[PDB]
Amino acid sequence: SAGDNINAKLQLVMKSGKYQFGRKSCLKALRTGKGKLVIVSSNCPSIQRSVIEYYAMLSKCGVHDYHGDNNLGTACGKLFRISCLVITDVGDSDIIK
Amino acid sequence: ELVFGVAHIFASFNDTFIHVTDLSGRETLVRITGGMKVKADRDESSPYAAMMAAQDVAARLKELGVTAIHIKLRASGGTKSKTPGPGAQSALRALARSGLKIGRIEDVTPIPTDSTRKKSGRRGRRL
Amino acid sequence: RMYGKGKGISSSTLPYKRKQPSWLKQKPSEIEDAIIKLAKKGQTPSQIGATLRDNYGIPQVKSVTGNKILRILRAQGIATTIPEDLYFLIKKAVSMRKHLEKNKKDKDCKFRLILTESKIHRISRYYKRKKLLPSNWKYQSSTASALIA
Amino acid sequence: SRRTKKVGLTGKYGTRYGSSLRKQIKKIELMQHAKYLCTFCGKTATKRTCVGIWKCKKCKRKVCGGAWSLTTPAAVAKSTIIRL
Amino acid sequence: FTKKEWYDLKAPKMFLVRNFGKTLVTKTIGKKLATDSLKGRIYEVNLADLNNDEDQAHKKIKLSCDHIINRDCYTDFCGLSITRDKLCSLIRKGYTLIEGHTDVKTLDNYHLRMFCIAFTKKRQNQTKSTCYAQTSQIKKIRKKMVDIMTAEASKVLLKDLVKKFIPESIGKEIEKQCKKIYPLQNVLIRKVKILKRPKLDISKLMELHT
Amino acid sequence: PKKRRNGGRSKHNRGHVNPLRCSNCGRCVPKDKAIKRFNIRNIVDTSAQRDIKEASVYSTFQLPKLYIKQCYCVSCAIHSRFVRVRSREQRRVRK
Amino acid sequence: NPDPVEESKKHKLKRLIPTPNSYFMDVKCPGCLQITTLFSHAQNVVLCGSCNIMLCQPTGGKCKLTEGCSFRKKIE
RNA sequence: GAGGUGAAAUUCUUAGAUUUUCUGGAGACGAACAACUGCGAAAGCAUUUGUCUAAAAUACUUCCAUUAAUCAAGAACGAAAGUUAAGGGAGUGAAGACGAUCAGAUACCGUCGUAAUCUUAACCAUAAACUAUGCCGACUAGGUGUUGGAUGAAGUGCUUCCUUCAGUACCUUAUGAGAAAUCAAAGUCUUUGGGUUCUG
């Protein structure tokens, strides 16, 4: 029972706070600095992982590899592959610490 | 000056193997059993056969010079029976009355931790 | 018991006293304020009531406030669109389906999946018997993963 | 509607060849022709191209495998290798 | 036969008698060296008959020959196990039986696989027939016992290990630690086996024998 | 009829048991039915025991106490006089 | 005469008239001097208000409390 | 000379069988602990370890607010045996060969030995699948236990006793029953009706 915590936190944050996902959208968020933390899928191509992680460390933001693959669609509430998440406005959730 | 030798006594409801070996456990000294003693095709495990064979090996070992004997008791096998055969007690009695030095007696009859199927089917034997 | 055997008579019994406890002085206004804030902070209503009873000491909310917990949560529009029990049971359903796809040999898992999905259909029929659910719900086993929202 | 009861994909062979060799063959081509999930993209779009190569339409990144199964018990020794 | 010669045996220095018996070897004719056949055998002697004491009549140690000069051999520790009669006599119904084993590599690059047998305790005030413990309790017993044994079985050398098997300073501390969780009864080490040993070390073996 | 209340086996809240084999005949019997005797018989009879003891050494050597734990099927048990038919009114009494 | 029964405490829960075995307590921490309210047979951990310290170990029974303190049944 | 038997024979054995001991392989199984003990709806499930998954029991001043019971149709699992396809194939071992005993013996007994038994993927849906007692629900009588809890008290943070749950058996009693054997449920039935299905 390790990833159940992150699953629940993501479930709460989708209800509670503004969210953006998609490669171009997350790039824009990290460039403008609005992003607060990024969730990256495990099976995402290594180039995307490297570029997102480098941009995060340059822009002073968090980063978190998910426990599983790019089937975060079943967890995030959508119905399609997503493979990357940027949380622009954390709502009332315990994801920061 | 005291020297020890192993004596395997194998009693399996039949011929009582007497097998005196070097204390190490290889290159045995004298193997007599009970078969070549009784020619009646029966009573191999009878006390008479074991007693006389044991007294013969006692005389032979007196001649050789070894006196101290450890005892290793084996009975049939892990798949046929579990109790020592009738002739084992007679062999022990004969070795006691022989005059040979006796050491330690121990049981080495194999005990199967597994449950390998033994002879006769589910209905079992009929005698 | 619904399945297997065993009555399991263990449960919780509410006290004979139905008014507010005489020692209590806390006011409902702050009681509803605190419950709304916490249920927004994130917790399902059963444990919401549990933590209200434990950490906050407001026994018999139906007595200390003139309304029940689900109704005071829903009256502000924050109400979850699926009931607590059905949501939890569907989560269990998707969990053992995720396991059984990996392992097609677990026969007791198959048994309990059949049992739980029968319970799912029964409870869904009950909840749509009232006006407490969209009438178009069918719960196909395909979109069960994302149906939790 | 359902044009056939049980023959299914092997109806292309007509009445020739015995049932003990048609039911036997049907066991495998059903899961051969069906597309498979791709690890590299998560899109179930990997088909067959030859006797031993599977290709994802989305990835355009082909992977070797068995004759008709992308994975097989003889190929699930990766767990023993990877436990190290 | 009449072509064989006596061969006395020797044991490492720490023991009390260091000389228990005489083995037998065939003649010295070719093409055998009359030494390779002697080498690589196994032994069995009571620790009671090797230390002249009654208390230690329930354990036996195998000895494997490792070096030969002149007439007397040198042997080496090869295996420890328990006597079958006391092994059986310990086990009786009404108590659950606890078994444990693991593999530990020693400080001397030696691999020894060992077993322990444990029993429950009636104690005084239970006034009942059965004396069984919970499955989780037994699992904790097994985990704690393996963790305890591996420390003192790896941090020391094999000579110190085999000497510490003489006063049995393992079971006493096993009992002391398990006192705080669940009381036990007579607990011991059933069998020791040599999983693997490196090549011959003449210098170390001869210094340990002297 | 229902001659025996427990059905010749302690089977209760159980579905199946691992079956063992009879020592004598080899027939398969479930564990909770076969007669079991946990037996402690000496290696040799006392007559030879005496001579062994005073022909032994250390003056404290003790002869081993062997263990058996043997089992028997119903038919072999009743054949080898391991059990008695007893009487109906007494049949219920065990110990 | 089962109606005026008196010693039915020893009887199982949901006796003649159901009555919970639980109760509420007021705990005073020794040397910390603060007031708070606590529920016996709770199911979640609790910390004080004045100084954040560990109170209870939640178990299926009546909770473990702390080594010291003075708890009084707040029942009226 | 060895297996062998109530005997004997078949069989193996001067090319060293049976037997002691050491090393490597294989397959099987997990005894002794083990029980009128546990879990599983049922068939079943006893070495250790890790992962994943479920269920039940207690306690609750937590929620839901009638969401329940049994079921024609239907569905899921379903011992051994058997069949299909690969693997694997020790031991046992339907077939069969034999050697015996026998008035004869195709069998009981003895030697060998094929299908099989074991693993993966599917069928087959039958058993004395037996507490032969369908399931749910209230009541009537006590004791002895015993498995897992929970409460209070005491031999010394630990160990027993008091009480109470859920199982779970046993022993006695029935102005209860029945044809009896017997049964605390097969009882609360001519003073005949708690609900429900199936069957003769």
PDB file of N, CA and C in Angstrom, chain E residues 49 54 84-85 88-93, chain F residues 38 40 58 60-62 64-67:
ATOM      1  N   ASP E  49      31.915 -39.261  23.821  1.00  0.00           N
ATOM      2  CA  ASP E  49      33.082 -40.120  23.695  1.00  0.00           C
ATOM      3  C   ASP E  49      34.320 -39.357  23.245  1.00  0.00           C
ATOM      4  N   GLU E  54      29.211 -37.063  30.383  1.00  0.00           N
ATOM      5  CA  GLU E  54      27.876 -37.593  30.121  1.00  0.00           C
ATOM      6  C   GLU E  54      26.962 -36.560  29.472  1.00  0.00           C
ATOM      7  N   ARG E  84      19.380 -39.433  16.938  1.00  0.00           N
ATOM      8  CA  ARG E  84      17.981 -39.663  16.597  1.00  0.00           C
ATOM      9  C   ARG E  84      17.142 -40.001  17.820  1.00  0.00           C
ATOM     10  N   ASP E  85      17.710 -40.713  18.795  1.00  0.00           N
ATOM     11  CA  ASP E  85      16.917 -41.114  19.953  1.00  0.00           C
ATOM     12  C   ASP E  85      16.461 -39.902  20.760  1.00  0.00           C
ATOM     13  N   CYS E  88      13.891 -37.804  18.770  1.00  0.00           N
ATOM     14  CA  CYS E  88      12.531 -38.308  18.918  1.00  0.00           C
ATOM     15  C   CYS E  88      11.998 -38.074  20.326  1.00  0.00           C
ATOM     16  N   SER E  89      12.832 -38.292  21.346  1.00  0.00           N
ATOM     17  CA  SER E  89      12.363 -38.196  22.723  1.00  0.00           C
ATOM     18  C   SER E  89      11.913 -36.788  23.072  1.00  0.00           C
ATOM     19  N   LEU E  90      12.501 -35.775  22.435  1.00  0.00           N
ATOM     20  CA  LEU E  90      12.067 -34.407  22.693  1.00  0.00           C
ATOM     21  C   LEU E  90      10.629 -34.190  22.241  1.00  0.00           C
ATOM     22  N   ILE E  91      10.281 -34.690  21.062  1.00  0.00           N
ATOM     23  CA  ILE E  91       8.972 -34.429  20.477  1.00  0.00           C
ATOM     24  C   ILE E  91       7.919 -35.273  21.181  1.00  0.00           C
ATOM     25  N   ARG E  92       6.880 -34.614  21.687  1.00  0.00           N
ATOM     26  CA  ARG E  92       5.711 -35.274  22.245  1.00  0.00           C
ATOM     27  C   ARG E  92       4.483 -34.452  21.888  1.00  0.00           C
ATOM     28  N   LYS E  93       3.330 -35.110  21.849  1.00  0.00           N
ATOM     29  CA  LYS E  93       2.109 -34.405  21.496  1.00  0.00           C
ATOM     30  C   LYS E  93       1.694 -33.463  22.619  1.00  0.00           C
TER      31      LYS E  93
ATOM     32  N   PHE F  38       1.109 -44.710  19.610  1.00  0.00           N
ATOM     33  CA  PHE F  38       2.420 -44.091  19.794  1.00  0.00           C
ATOM     34  C   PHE F  38       3.183 -44.976  20.764  1.00  0.00           C
ATOM     35  N   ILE F  40       6.546 -46.964  22.505  1.00  0.00           N
ATOM     36  CA  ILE F  40       7.918 -46.828  22.985  1.00  0.00           C
ATOM     37  C   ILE F  40       8.352 -48.217  23.437  1.00  0.00           C
ATOM     38  N   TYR F  58      31.818 -47.122  30.940  1.00  0.00           N
ATOM     39  CA  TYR F  58      31.549 -45.854  31.624  1.00  0.00           C
ATOM     40  C   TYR F  58      30.680 -46.022  32.867  1.00  0.00           C
ATOM     41  N   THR F  60      27.816 -45.809  33.327  1.00  0.00           N
ATOM     42  CA  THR F  60      26.624 -44.975  33.277  1.00  0.00           C
ATOM     43  C   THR F  60      25.955 -44.980  31.912  1.00  0.00           C
ATOM     44  N   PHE F  61      26.471 -45.737  30.949  1.00  0.00           N
ATOM     45  CA  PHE F  61      25.844 -45.822  29.639  1.00  0.00           C
ATOM     46  C   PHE F  61      24.403 -46.297  29.761  1.00  0.00           C
ATOM     47  N   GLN F  62      23.499 -45.602  29.075  1.00  0.00           N
ATOM     48  CA  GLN F  62      22.080 -45.932  29.078  1.00  0.00           C
ATOM     49  C   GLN F  62      21.657 -46.336  27.673  1.00  0.00           C
ATOM     50  N   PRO F  64      19.385 -46.737  24.399  1.00  0.00           N
ATOM     51  CA  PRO F  64      18.464 -45.744  23.836  1.00  0.00           C
ATOM     52  C   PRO F  64      17.004 -46.142  23.975  1.00  0.00           C
ATOM     53  N   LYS F  65      16.153 -45.123  24.097  1.00  0.00           N
ATOM     54  CA  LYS F  65      14.706 -45.293  24.169  1.00  0.00           C
ATOM     55  C   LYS F  65      14.111 -44.944  22.808  1.00  0.00           C
ATOM     56  N   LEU F  66      13.922 -45.960  21.971  1.00  0.00           N
ATOM     57  CA  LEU F  66      13.446 -45.789  20.607  1.00  0.00           C
ATOM     58  C   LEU F  66      11.960 -45.421  20.604  1.00  0.00           C
ATOM     59  N   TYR F  67      11.523 -44.795  19.511  1.00  0.00           N
ATOM     60  CA  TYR F  67      10.152 -44.336  19.343  1.00  0.00           C
ATOM     61  C   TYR F  67       9.580 -44.914  18.055  1.00  0.00           C
TER      62      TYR F  67
END
